[PDB]
Amino acid sequence: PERRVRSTLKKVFGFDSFKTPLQESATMAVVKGNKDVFVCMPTGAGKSLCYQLPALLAKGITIVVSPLIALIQDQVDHLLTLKVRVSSLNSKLSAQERKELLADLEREKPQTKILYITPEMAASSSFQPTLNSLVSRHLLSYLVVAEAHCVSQWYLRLGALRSRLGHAPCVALTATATPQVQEDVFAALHAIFKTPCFRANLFYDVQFKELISDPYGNLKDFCLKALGQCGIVYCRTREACEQLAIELSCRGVNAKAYHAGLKASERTLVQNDWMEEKVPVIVATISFGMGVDKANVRFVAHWNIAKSMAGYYQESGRAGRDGKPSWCRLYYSRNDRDQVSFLIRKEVAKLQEKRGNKASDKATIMAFDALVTFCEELGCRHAAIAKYFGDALPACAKGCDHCQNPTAVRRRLEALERSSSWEAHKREWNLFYQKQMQLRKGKDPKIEEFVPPDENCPLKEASSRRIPRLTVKAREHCLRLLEEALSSNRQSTRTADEADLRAKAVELEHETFRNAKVANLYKASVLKKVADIHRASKDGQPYDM
DNA sequence: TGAAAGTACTTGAGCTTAGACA
Protein backbone atom coordinates (compact mmCIF):
# COMPACT_ATOMS: atom_id res chain seq x y z
CA PRO A 1 0.00 0.00 0.00
CA GLU A 2 0.98 3.65 -0.45
CA ARG A 3 0.82 4.21 3.30
CA ARG A 4 2.74 0.95 3.71
CA VAL A 5 5.59 2.13 1.47
CA ARG A 6 5.50 5.53 3.20
CA SER A 7 6.10 3.71 6.48
CA THR A 8 8.64 1.46 4.73
CA LEU A 9 10.65 4.62 4.09
CA LYS A 10 11.11 4.68 7.86
CA LYS A 11 11.51 0.89 7.89
CA VAL A 12 14.24 1.04 5.23
CA PHE A 13 15.82 4.48 5.58
CA GLY A 14 14.43 5.83 8.85
CA PHE A 15 12.39 8.89 7.89
CA ASP A 16 8.87 8.70 9.30
CA SER A 17 7.35 10.81 6.51
CA PHE A 18 8.33 13.15 3.68
CA LYS A 19 10.43 16.20 4.52
CA THR A 20 8.63 18.63 2.20
CA PRO A 21 5.56 18.72 -0.05
CA LEU A 22 8.15 18.26 -2.81
CA GLN A 23 8.28 14.56 -1.96
CA GLU A 24 4.58 14.47 -1.02
CA SER A 25 3.75 15.35 -4.64
CA ALA A 26 6.60 13.94 -6.73
CA THR A 27 7.10 10.58 -5.01
CA MET A 28 3.33 10.11 -4.75
CA ALA A 29 3.00 10.67 -8.50
CA VAL A 30 5.88 8.27 -9.18
CA VAL A 31 4.19 5.64 -6.99
CA LYS A 32 1.02 6.17 -9.02
CA GLY A 33 2.90 6.62 -12.31
CA ASN A 34 1.93 9.34 -14.78
CA LYS A 35 4.79 10.62 -16.96
CA ASP A 36 8.31 12.06 -16.84
CA VAL A 37 9.17 13.73 -13.52
CA PHE A 38 11.14 17.00 -13.60
CA VAL A 39 12.08 18.38 -10.17
CA CYS A 40 14.49 21.17 -9.21
CA MET A 41 15.56 21.30 -5.56
CA PRO A 42 18.84 21.91 -3.71
CA THR A 43 21.26 19.01 -4.09
CA GLY A 44 21.55 16.75 -1.07
CA ALA A 45 19.46 14.11 0.69
CA GLY A 46 16.03 15.18 -0.59
CA LYS A 47 16.44 14.87 -4.35
CA SER A 48 18.35 11.62 -3.84
CA LEU A 49 15.41 10.11 -1.95
CA CYS A 50 13.04 11.46 -4.61
CA TYR A 51 14.27 8.56 -6.78
CA GLN A 52 15.70 6.17 -4.17
CA LEU A 53 12.30 5.89 -2.47
CA PRO A 54 10.56 4.77 -5.70
CA ALA A 55 13.54 2.45 -6.23
CA LEU A 56 12.48 0.51 -3.13
CA LEU A 57 9.36 -0.72 -4.94
CA ALA A 58 11.16 -0.72 -8.28
CA LYS A 59 9.28 -3.75 -9.69
CA GLY A 60 12.47 -5.72 -10.22
CA ILE A 61 15.25 -3.38 -11.34
CA THR A 62 15.28 0.39 -11.81
CA ILE A 63 17.62 1.79 -14.46
CA VAL A 64 18.92 5.27 -13.64
CA VAL A 65 19.36 7.60 -16.59
CA SER A 66 22.53 8.53 -14.66
CA PRO A 67 23.10 9.59 -11.02
CA LEU A 68 25.01 12.74 -12.15
CA ILE A 69 28.14 11.60 -14.05
CA ALA A 70 30.73 10.87 -11.33
CA LEU A 71 30.11 10.93 -7.48
CA ILE A 72 28.34 7.57 -8.06
CA GLN A 73 31.10 6.12 -5.80
CA ASP A 74 29.31 8.15 -3.01
CA GLN A 75 25.71 7.16 -3.71
CA VAL A 76 26.74 3.49 -4.00
CA ASP A 77 28.62 4.01 -0.74
CA HIS A 78 25.43 5.52 0.66
CA LEU A 79 22.80 2.75 0.32
CA LEU A 80 24.71 -0.55 0.55
CA THR A 81 24.23 -0.35 4.34
CA LEU A 82 20.78 1.27 4.12
CA LYS A 83 18.74 -1.96 3.95
CA VAL A 84 18.53 -1.94 0.14
CA ARG A 85 19.99 -3.85 -2.83
CA VAL A 86 22.05 -1.32 -4.79
CA SER A 87 24.98 -1.60 -7.19
CA SER A 88 26.95 0.65 -9.58
CA LEU A 89 30.42 -0.50 -10.94
CA ASN A 90 32.64 1.55 -13.33
CA SER A 91 36.05 1.71 -11.57
CA LYS A 92 37.62 -0.65 -14.19
CA LEU A 93 38.65 -3.16 -11.48
CA SER A 94 34.88 -3.67 -11.81
CA ALA A 95 35.65 -6.67 -14.09
CA GLN A 96 36.94 -8.57 -11.00
CA GLU A 97 33.37 -8.29 -9.65
CA ARG A 98 31.40 -6.34 -12.32
CA LYS A 99 31.88 -9.02 -14.95
CA GLU A 100 29.92 -11.61 -12.93
CA LEU A 101 27.51 -8.92 -11.75
CA LEU A 102 26.83 -8.51 -15.48
CA ALA A 103 26.01 -12.23 -15.24
CA ASP A 104 24.16 -11.41 -12.01
CA LEU A 105 22.34 -9.00 -14.39
CA GLU A 106 21.86 -11.70 -17.02
CA ARG A 107 20.53 -13.67 -14.00
CA GLU A 108 16.71 -13.22 -14.13
CA LYS A 109 15.01 -11.76 -11.00
CA PRO A 110 18.40 -10.84 -9.41
CA GLN A 111 19.13 -9.93 -5.74
CA THR A 112 19.66 -6.39 -7.18
CA LYS A 113 16.89 -3.75 -7.48
CA ILE A 114 18.97 -0.62 -8.25
CA LEU A 115 21.74 -0.24 -10.84
CA TYR A 116 23.81 2.88 -11.20
CA ILE A 117 25.12 3.63 -14.67
CA THR A 118 25.83 6.78 -16.67
CA PRO A 119 26.77 7.70 -20.31
CA GLU A 120 30.43 7.48 -19.30
CA MET A 121 30.60 3.79 -19.75
CA ALA A 122 27.27 2.19 -20.81
CA ALA A 123 27.91 3.07 -24.48
CA SER A 124 30.72 0.53 -24.15
CA SER A 125 30.56 -2.84 -25.89
CA SER A 126 30.25 -4.49 -22.46
CA PHE A 127 26.73 -3.05 -22.34
CA GLN A 128 25.40 -2.92 -25.92
CA PRO A 129 24.24 -6.57 -25.75
CA THR A 130 23.77 -6.26 -21.99
CA LEU A 131 21.21 -3.45 -22.21
CA ASN A 132 19.16 -5.31 -24.82
CA SER A 133 19.32 -8.53 -22.81
CA LEU A 134 18.25 -6.69 -19.65
CA VAL A 135 15.34 -4.88 -21.30
CA SER A 136 14.19 -8.11 -22.94
CA ARG A 137 14.60 -10.26 -19.82
CA HIS A 138 11.57 -9.25 -17.77
CA LEU A 139 11.32 -5.43 -17.52
CA LEU A 140 13.33 -2.24 -17.01
CA SER A 141 11.74 0.33 -14.71
CA TYR A 142 12.21 4.08 -14.20
CA LEU A 143 14.89 6.37 -15.65
CA VAL A 144 16.45 9.03 -13.37
CA VAL A 145 19.02 11.53 -14.74
CA ALA A 146 18.74 13.82 -11.72
CA GLU A 147 21.27 16.45 -12.99
CA ALA A 148 21.35 18.70 -16.10
CA HIS A 149 24.58 17.32 -17.72
CA CYS A 150 22.19 15.82 -20.32
CA VAL A 151 21.47 18.94 -22.41
CA SER A 152 24.35 20.59 -20.50
CA GLN A 153 26.91 18.01 -21.73
CA TRP A 154 30.46 17.95 -23.16
CA TYR A 155 28.21 11.52 -25.86
CA LEU A 156 25.08 12.66 -24.04
CA ARG A 157 22.23 11.09 -26.12
CA LEU A 158 18.99 12.81 -24.95
CA GLY A 159 17.27 9.80 -26.52
CA ALA A 160 19.30 7.12 -24.72
CA LEU A 161 17.31 4.56 -22.73
CA ARG A 162 14.26 6.57 -23.90
CA SER A 163 14.32 7.38 -27.59
CA ARG A 164 16.50 4.27 -28.06
CA LEU A 165 15.10 2.11 -25.18
CA GLY A 166 12.10 4.01 -23.70
CA HIS A 167 10.53 1.29 -21.52
CA ALA A 168 9.36 3.24 -18.41
CA PRO A 169 8.66 6.77 -16.97
CA CYS A 170 11.68 9.11 -16.54
CA VAL A 171 12.93 11.05 -13.47
CA ALA A 172 14.74 14.42 -13.68
CA LEU A 173 15.68 15.66 -10.19
CA THR A 174 18.02 18.43 -11.29
CA ALA A 175 19.05 21.54 -9.35
CA THR A 176 18.60 24.06 -12.20
CA ALA A 177 15.24 24.70 -13.89
CA THR A 178 15.77 27.74 -16.09
CA PRO A 179 12.97 28.09 -18.68
CA GLN A 180 15.23 27.20 -21.61
CA VAL A 181 16.77 24.27 -19.71
CA GLN A 182 13.40 22.89 -18.61
CA GLU A 183 12.04 23.24 -22.15
CA ASP A 184 15.12 21.37 -23.41
CA VAL A 185 14.63 18.55 -20.90
CA PHE A 186 11.00 18.49 -22.02
CA ALA A 187 12.03 18.22 -25.70
CA ALA A 188 15.61 16.93 -25.99
CA LEU A 189 14.88 14.48 -23.16
CA HIS A 190 11.52 13.70 -24.82
CA ALA A 191 5.36 15.09 -10.37
CA ILE A 192 6.92 18.16 -11.98
CA PHE A 193 7.25 20.88 -9.34
CA LYS A 194 9.98 23.33 -8.34
CA THR A 195 10.18 25.15 -5.01
CA PRO A 196 10.81 28.90 -5.14
CA CYS A 197 13.96 28.61 -3.07
CA PHE A 198 14.13 32.22 -1.81
CA ARG A 199 16.97 31.42 0.62
CA ALA A 200 17.22 34.72 2.45
CA ASN A 201 20.04 33.16 4.49
CA LEU A 202 22.25 33.45 1.39
CA PHE A 203 23.12 37.16 1.27
CA TYR A 204 23.79 37.61 -2.44
CA ASP A 205 26.20 40.55 -2.51
CA VAL A 206 28.20 41.74 -5.52
CA GLN A 207 31.46 43.66 -5.10
CA PHE A 208 33.45 45.10 -8.00
CA LYS A 209 37.20 44.51 -7.97
CA GLU A 210 37.56 47.51 -10.30
CA LEU A 211 36.50 49.69 -7.35
CA ILE A 212 38.21 47.68 -4.60
CA SER A 213 41.73 48.99 -4.06
CA ASP A 214 42.88 45.72 -2.44
CA PRO A 215 40.74 42.81 -3.67
CA TYR A 216 42.81 40.27 -1.74
CA GLY A 217 42.33 42.05 1.58
CA ASN A 218 38.64 42.57 0.82
CA LEU A 219 38.17 38.85 0.19
CA LYS A 220 40.18 38.03 3.31
CA ASP A 221 37.99 40.18 5.54
CA PHE A 222 34.95 38.73 3.77
CA CYS A 223 36.10 35.25 4.79
CA LEU A 224 37.01 36.42 8.30
CA LYS A 225 33.62 38.13 8.64
CA ALA A 226 32.10 34.70 7.94
CA LEU A 227 33.74 33.39 11.15
CA GLY A 228 35.41 30.01 11.57
CA GLN A 229 32.26 27.90 11.17
CA CYS A 230 34.27 25.61 5.60
CA GLY A 231 34.07 27.84 2.52
CA ILE A 232 34.36 27.77 -1.27
CA VAL A 233 36.10 30.28 -3.54
CA TYR A 234 35.40 30.04 -7.27
CA CYS A 235 37.68 31.15 -10.11
CA ARG A 236 38.13 30.11 -13.74
CA THR A 237 41.64 28.74 -14.32
CA ARG A 238 43.81 26.20 -12.46
CA GLU A 239 46.56 28.81 -12.54
CA ALA A 240 44.04 31.12 -10.89
CA CYS A 241 43.20 28.32 -8.46
CA GLU A 242 46.85 28.10 -7.40
CA GLN A 243 47.29 31.88 -7.29
CA LEU A 244 44.25 32.54 -5.09
CA ALA A 245 45.11 29.57 -2.87
CA ILE A 246 48.67 30.83 -2.32
CA GLU A 247 47.58 34.44 -1.77
CA LEU A 248 44.84 33.44 0.68
CA SER A 249 47.16 31.14 2.63
CA CYS A 250 49.72 33.95 2.82
CA ARG A 251 46.88 36.27 3.93
CA GLY A 252 45.96 33.73 6.65
CA VAL A 253 42.81 32.09 5.16
CA ASN A 254 43.85 28.39 5.15
CA ALA A 255 43.22 27.97 1.42
CA LYS A 256 43.78 25.03 -0.97
CA ALA A 257 42.80 23.90 -4.53
CA TYR A 258 40.69 21.09 -6.16
CA HIS A 259 42.23 20.53 -9.77
CA ALA A 260 45.65 21.56 -11.11
CA GLY A 261 46.72 18.79 -13.43
CA LEU A 262 46.76 16.82 -10.17
CA LYS A 263 44.85 13.57 -9.84
CA ALA A 264 41.80 12.06 -8.14
CA SER A 265 44.44 10.41 -5.93
CA GLU A 266 46.25 13.78 -5.75
CA ARG A 267 43.02 15.58 -4.72
CA THR A 268 40.78 12.92 -3.11
CA LEU A 269 42.45 14.22 0.06
CA VAL A 270 42.05 17.98 -0.54
CA GLN A 271 38.35 17.23 -1.20
CA ASN A 272 37.45 14.72 1.53
CA ASP A 273 39.59 16.33 4.20
CA TRP A 274 37.74 19.54 3.30
CA MET A 275 34.49 18.15 4.75
CA GLU A 276 36.17 17.22 8.06
CA GLU A 277 37.56 20.75 8.61
CA LYS A 278 41.12 19.55 8.03
CA VAL A 279 41.22 21.98 5.10
CA PRO A 280 39.10 25.07 5.89
CA VAL A 281 38.96 26.64 2.41
CA ILE A 282 39.42 25.07 -1.03
CA VAL A 283 39.23 26.72 -4.46
CA ALA A 284 38.11 25.20 -7.78
CA THR A 285 36.59 26.22 -11.10
CA ILE A 286 33.82 23.71 -11.91
CA SER A 287 35.15 20.71 -9.99
CA PHE A 288 32.79 21.26 -7.03
CA GLY A 289 29.42 20.35 -8.48
CA MET A 290 29.84 17.09 -6.56
CA GLY A 291 31.70 15.62 -3.61
CA VAL A 292 29.18 15.33 -0.77
CA ASP A 293 27.23 18.56 -0.45
CA LYS A 294 28.04 19.14 3.22
CA ALA A 295 26.13 21.17 5.81
CA ASN A 296 28.45 23.85 7.26
CA VAL A 297 29.31 25.70 4.04
CA ARG A 298 29.85 29.19 5.46
CA PHE A 299 30.34 31.04 2.17
CA VAL A 300 30.72 30.66 -1.59
CA ALA A 301 32.79 33.33 -3.34
CA HIS A 302 33.35 33.85 -7.07
CA TRP A 303 36.69 35.51 -7.79
CA ASN A 304 35.64 35.52 -11.45
CA ILE A 305 32.07 35.62 -12.73
CA ALA A 306 30.38 32.33 -13.55
CA LYS A 307 29.38 31.13 -17.01
CA SER A 308 25.66 31.90 -16.57
CA MET A 309 22.84 32.44 -14.11
CA ALA A 310 22.24 28.69 -14.18
CA GLY A 311 25.93 28.08 -13.54
CA TYR A 312 26.16 30.74 -10.85
CA TYR A 313 23.12 29.41 -9.02
CA GLN A 314 24.38 25.84 -9.23
CA GLU A 315 27.71 26.86 -7.67
CA SER A 316 25.97 28.98 -5.02
CA GLY A 317 23.68 26.05 -4.21
CA ARG A 318 26.66 24.17 -2.81
CA ALA A 319 26.00 26.11 0.40
CA GLY A 320 23.29 26.89 2.90
CA ARG A 321 22.30 23.27 3.59
CA ASP A 322 21.59 24.54 7.15
CA GLY A 323 20.24 27.60 8.90
CA LYS A 324 23.72 29.10 8.61
CA PRO A 325 23.49 32.60 7.09
CA SER A 326 25.92 32.16 4.19
CA TRP A 327 26.54 35.47 2.44
CA CYS A 328 27.68 34.34 -1.01
CA ARG A 329 29.62 37.03 -2.86
CA LEU A 330 30.41 37.60 -6.55
CA TYR A 331 33.50 39.54 -7.58
CA TYR A 332 32.95 41.44 -10.80
CA SER A 333 35.03 43.46 -13.24
CA ARG A 334 34.61 44.64 -16.82
CA ASN A 335 37.91 43.01 -17.76
CA ASP A 336 36.56 39.62 -16.53
CA ARG A 337 33.24 39.42 -18.50
CA ASP A 338 35.19 40.77 -21.50
CA GLN A 339 37.48 37.70 -21.29
CA VAL A 340 34.68 35.21 -20.52
CA SER A 341 32.57 36.32 -23.52
CA PHE A 342 35.59 36.29 -25.90
CA LEU A 343 36.11 32.58 -25.03
CA ILE A 344 32.33 31.81 -24.95
CA ARG A 345 32.51 33.25 -28.50
CA LYS A 346 35.56 31.05 -29.42
CA GLU A 347 33.69 28.04 -27.98
CA VAL A 348 30.41 28.87 -29.75
CA ALA A 349 32.53 29.30 -32.90
CA LYS A 350 34.43 25.98 -32.80
CA LEU A 351 31.14 24.31 -31.86
CA GLN A 352 29.28 25.76 -34.87
CA GLU A 353 32.32 25.04 -37.08
CA LYS A 354 32.21 21.31 -36.20
CA ARG A 355 28.37 21.31 -36.08
CA GLY A 356 25.22 23.19 -37.12
CA ASN A 357 23.12 26.04 -35.75
CA LYS A 358 21.24 25.02 -32.60
CA ALA A 359 19.25 26.82 -29.93
CA SER A 360 22.16 26.26 -27.53
CA ASP A 361 24.42 28.31 -29.83
CA LYS A 362 22.51 31.44 -28.83
CA ALA A 363 21.42 29.98 -25.48
CA THR A 364 24.94 30.12 -24.04
CA ILE A 365 25.41 33.67 -25.34
CA MET A 366 22.17 35.03 -23.91
CA ALA A 367 22.71 33.15 -20.64
CA PHE A 368 26.08 34.84 -20.18
CA ASP A 369 24.52 38.16 -21.17
CA ALA A 370 21.80 37.57 -18.57
CA LEU A 371 24.56 36.99 -16.01
CA VAL A 372 26.23 40.24 -17.09
CA THR A 373 22.97 42.16 -16.77
CA PHE A 374 22.21 40.59 -13.38
CA CYS A 375 25.61 41.67 -12.08
CA GLU A 376 25.00 45.07 -13.72
CA GLU A 377 21.28 45.63 -13.06
CA LEU A 378 19.90 47.55 -10.08
CA GLY A 379 17.55 45.78 -7.69
CA CYS A 380 17.14 42.90 -5.29
CA ARG A 381 19.33 39.90 -6.10
CA HIS A 382 16.56 37.48 -5.10
CA ALA A 383 14.15 39.38 -7.35
CA ALA A 384 16.53 39.03 -10.29
CA ILE A 385 16.99 35.32 -9.55
CA ALA A 386 13.23 34.77 -9.48
CA LYS A 387 12.82 36.79 -12.69
CA TYR A 388 15.42 34.63 -14.42
CA PHE A 389 13.60 31.52 -13.15
CA GLY A 390 10.24 33.19 -13.77
CA ASP A 391 9.17 32.59 -10.17
CA ALA A 392 7.39 35.12 -7.97
CA LEU A 393 9.67 38.08 -7.34
CA PRO A 394 10.48 38.25 -3.61
CA ALA A 395 10.60 41.65 -1.87
CA CYS A 396 13.46 40.42 0.29
CA ALA A 397 15.03 42.43 3.10
CA LYS A 398 18.57 42.21 4.51
CA GLY A 399 19.37 39.68 1.80
CA CYS A 400 21.14 41.72 -0.86
CA ASP A 401 23.20 44.88 -1.30
CA HIS A 402 20.21 46.69 -2.81
CA CYS A 403 18.10 46.49 0.35
CA GLN A 404 20.92 47.53 2.70
CA ASN A 405 21.80 51.03 1.45
CA PRO A 406 19.66 52.79 -1.19
CA THR A 407 22.53 55.05 -2.35
CA ALA A 408 25.85 53.32 -1.56
CA VAL A 409 25.36 50.53 -4.10
CA ARG A 410 24.05 53.12 -6.55
CA ARG A 411 27.21 55.14 -5.92
CA ARG A 412 29.34 52.05 -6.59
CA LEU A 413 27.45 51.35 -9.82
CA GLU A 414 27.90 54.97 -10.92
CA ALA A 415 31.62 54.82 -10.09
CA LEU A 416 31.86 51.66 -12.20
CA GLU A 417 31.04 53.76 -15.27
CA ARG A 418 33.38 56.50 -14.03
CA SER A 419 36.07 53.86 -13.38
CA SER A 420 37.00 53.73 -17.08
CA SER A 421 35.39 55.67 -19.91
CA TRP A 422 35.27 54.56 -23.56
CA GLU A 423 55.04 47.24 -28.24
CA ALA A 424 52.59 47.06 -25.33
CA HIS A 425 49.97 48.99 -27.32
CA LYS A 426 49.53 46.40 -30.08
CA ARG A 427 48.00 43.72 -27.85
CA GLU A 428 45.89 46.32 -26.05
CA TRP A 429 44.52 47.61 -29.36
CA ASN A 430 43.88 44.10 -30.67
CA LEU A 431 42.01 43.08 -27.52
CA PHE A 432 39.99 46.31 -27.39
CA TYR A 433 39.12 46.13 -31.10
CA GLN A 434 38.06 42.48 -31.04
CA LYS A 435 36.11 42.92 -27.79
CA GLN A 436 34.31 45.99 -29.13
CA MET A 437 33.39 44.29 -32.40
CA GLN A 438 32.19 41.22 -30.50
CA LEU A 439 29.58 43.62 -29.15
CA ARG A 440 28.66 44.43 -32.75
CA LYS A 441 28.34 40.71 -33.49
CA GLY A 442 26.07 40.35 -30.46
CA LYS A 443 24.17 37.11 -29.99
CA ASP A 444 23.53 34.20 -32.39
CA PRO A 445 26.29 34.89 -34.96
CA LYS A 446 25.27 32.03 -37.31
CA ILE A 447 24.07 33.24 -40.74
CA GLU A 448 26.16 31.20 -43.18
CA GLU A 449 23.55 29.64 -45.52
CA PHE A 450 25.85 29.07 -48.48
CA VAL A 451 23.20 28.42 -51.13
CA PRO A 452 24.56 26.17 -53.91
CA PRO A 453 24.22 27.35 -57.51
CA ASP A 454 20.64 26.69 -58.53
CA GLU A 455 20.53 24.83 -61.86
CA ASN A 456 22.68 26.31 -64.63
CA CYS A 457 25.51 28.35 -63.11
CA PRO A 458 27.89 29.61 -65.83
CA LEU A 459 30.81 29.73 -63.40
CA LYS A 460 34.00 27.69 -63.47
CA GLU A 461 34.72 26.52 -59.90
CA ALA A 462 31.33 27.89 -58.86
CA SER A 463 31.08 25.75 -55.71
CA SER A 464 34.17 27.21 -54.05
CA ARG A 465 34.66 28.57 -50.53
CA ARG A 466 38.17 29.98 -51.01
CA ILE A 467 36.68 33.48 -50.72
CA PRO A 468 34.61 33.88 -47.51
CA ARG A 469 31.22 35.59 -47.76
CA LEU A 470 31.14 35.31 -51.57
CA THR A 471 27.73 33.66 -51.92
CA VAL A 472 26.86 32.44 -55.41
CA LYS A 473 24.50 35.36 -56.01
CA ALA A 474 27.34 37.87 -55.69
CA ARG A 475 29.44 35.72 -58.01
CA GLU A 476 26.97 35.47 -60.86
CA HIS A 477 26.14 39.16 -60.48
CA CYS A 478 29.84 39.92 -60.97
CA LEU A 479 29.79 37.59 -63.97
CA ARG A 480 26.72 39.51 -65.19
CA LEU A 481 28.75 42.73 -64.96
CA LEU A 482 31.64 41.09 -66.83
CA GLU A 483 29.33 39.90 -69.61
CA GLU A 484 27.80 43.38 -69.86
CA ALA A 485 31.30 44.83 -70.24
CA LEU A 486 32.15 42.21 -72.86
CA SER A 487 28.94 42.98 -74.77
CA SER A 488 29.72 46.70 -74.69
CA ASN A 489 33.21 45.97 -76.03
CA ARG A 490 31.67 43.71 -78.69
CA GLN A 491 29.39 46.54 -79.80
CA SER A 492 32.31 49.00 -79.76
CA THR A 493 34.74 46.69 -81.60
CA ARG A 494 32.61 44.63 -84.06
CA THR A 495 33.90 41.12 -83.41
CA ALA A 496 32.22 37.79 -84.20
CA ASP A 497 29.30 37.36 -81.77
CA GLU A 498 28.29 36.95 -78.12
CA ALA A 499 28.06 33.15 -78.31
CA ASP A 500 31.76 32.84 -77.48
CA LEU A 501 31.40 35.80 -75.11
CA ARG A 502 29.58 33.55 -72.62
CA ALA A 503 32.60 31.26 -72.24
CA LYS A 504 34.94 34.27 -72.38
CA ALA A 505 33.14 35.89 -69.44
CA VAL A 506 33.08 32.61 -67.51
CA GLU A 507 36.84 32.32 -68.04
CA LEU A 508 37.40 35.93 -66.97
CA GLU A 509 35.31 35.49 -63.82
CA HIS A 510 37.11 32.26 -62.91
CA GLU A 511 40.50 33.91 -63.46
CA THR A 512 39.52 36.88 -61.29
CA PHE A 513 38.22 34.53 -58.59
CA ARG A 514 41.51 32.61 -58.67
CA ASN A 515 43.61 35.78 -58.44
CA ALA A 516 41.45 37.09 -55.58
CA LYS A 517 41.20 35.98 -51.96
CA VAL A 518 38.45 38.08 -50.35
CA ALA A 519 35.12 39.40 -51.61
CA ASN A 520 36.06 43.08 -51.54
CA LEU A 521 39.33 42.51 -53.41
CA TYR A 522 37.52 40.21 -55.84
CA LYS A 523 35.02 42.96 -56.65
CA ALA A 524 37.83 45.49 -56.93
CA SER A 525 39.57 43.29 -59.50
CA VAL A 526 36.31 42.57 -61.35
CA LEU A 527 35.46 46.23 -61.86
CA LYS A 528 39.13 46.97 -62.57
CA LYS A 529 38.92 44.51 -65.47
CA VAL A 530 35.61 46.09 -66.49
CA ALA A 531 37.23 49.54 -66.49
CA ASP A 532 40.14 48.20 -68.55
CA ILE A 533 37.68 46.74 -71.06
CA HIS A 534 35.83 50.06 -71.24
CA ARG A 535 39.11 51.94 -71.78
CA ALA A 536 40.06 49.53 -74.56
CA SER A 537 36.67 50.10 -76.17
CA LYS A 538 37.13 53.87 -75.86
CA ASP A 539 40.52 53.71 -77.57
CA GLY A 540 38.97 51.68 -80.42
CA GLN A 541 41.09 48.55 -80.83
CA PRO A 542 39.48 45.16 -80.13
CA TYR A 543 39.89 43.85 -76.59
CA ASP A 544 42.40 41.07 -77.15
CA MET A 545 42.92 38.42 -74.48
C1' DT B 1 67.75 77.89 -17.03
C1' DG B 2 69.10 74.14 -20.15
C1' DA B 3 72.06 69.66 -18.92
C1' DA B 4 72.85 61.77 -19.48
C1' DA B 5 73.32 57.14 -19.74
C1' DG B 6 73.54 52.67 -17.99
C1' DT B 7 72.05 49.64 -14.10
C1' DA B 8 70.20 47.87 -9.67
C1' DC B 9 65.97 47.27 -7.39
C1' DT B 10 60.34 46.53 -6.86
C1' DT B 11 55.53 44.92 -8.35
C1' DG B 12 52.02 43.49 -10.31
C1' DA B 13 49.98 41.63 -13.56
C1' DG B 14 47.74 37.62 -15.86
C1' DC B 15 44.79 32.51 -17.51
C1' DT B 16 38.97 27.85 -20.07
C1' DT B 17 36.94 23.52 -18.44
C1' DA B 18 34.31 19.97 -15.71
C1' DG B 19 32.92 13.95 -16.71
C1' DA B 20 32.96 7.69 -18.74
C1' DC B 21 39.69 4.11 -21.98
C1' DA B 22 45.92 1.12 -19.21
Curated annotation (Swiss-Prot):
Keyword Cell cycle appears in the UniProt entry: yes
Variant or mutagenesis effect after changing residue 475 to A: Impairs protein folding and abolishes interaction with POLR2A
Domain of life from the UniProt record: Eukaryota
The reaction(s) this protein catalyses: Couples ATP hydrolysis with the unwinding of duplex DNA by translocating in the 3'-5' direction; ATP + H2O = ADP + phosphate + H(+)
Cofactor: how and how many bound: Binds a Zn(2+) ion per subunit.
Domain named Helicase ATP-binding: residues: 28-190
Distribution of this protein across tissues and organs: Ubiquitous.
UniProt cofactor(s): Zn(2+)
Gene Ontology CC, one term: replication fork
Listed result of changing residue 528 to E: Abolishes interaction with POLR2A
Region called Interaction with POLR2A, residue ranges: 423-545
Summary of subunit composition and partner proteins: Monomer. Interacts with TOP2A, TOP3A and TOP3B. Isoform beta interacts with RNA polymerase II subunit POLR2A. Identified in a complex with the RNA polymerase II core bound to DNA. Interacts (via C-terminus) with POLR1A. Isoform beta interacts with RAD51. Interacts with WRN; this interaction stimulates WRN helicase activity on DNA fork duplexes. Interacts with MUS1; this interaction promotes MUS81-dependent mitotic DNA synthesis.
Family: Belongs to the helicase family. RecQ subfamily.
Comment on protein domains: The alpha-helix immediately C-terminal to the Zn(2+)-binding site (residues 438-453, characterized in C-terminally truncated contructs) is required for helicase activity, is positively charged, and may play a role in DNA-binding and choice of substrates.
Name of this protein: ATP-dependent DNA helicase Q5
Residues of the full protein shown: 12 to 620 of 991
